[PDB]
């Protein structure tokens, strides 16, 4: 019975806003690089 | 058709340069930038 509130509190603590914003920063890094189109490759293909 | 071939070469050069001048890659990069400023401005991290 005691493990239940402890389990809920640990579940809340482990996945707190820290990890959420860490993954948000991962997504923002993807935006900074993965969602950018390399105009250099565009011009290389045009010149090819 | 050698004159025709040279004219086609010049026209292809002009078309490639014109398309290069208006490539959407720059627009997409600018849009990703705008998304970055919007996300940082409306402060998702504080909300979470």
UniProtKB/Swiss-Prot annotation, chain A:
Protein name, as recorded: Apolipoprotein B-48
Organism the protein comes from: Homo sapiens (Human)
Tree of life domain: Eukaryota
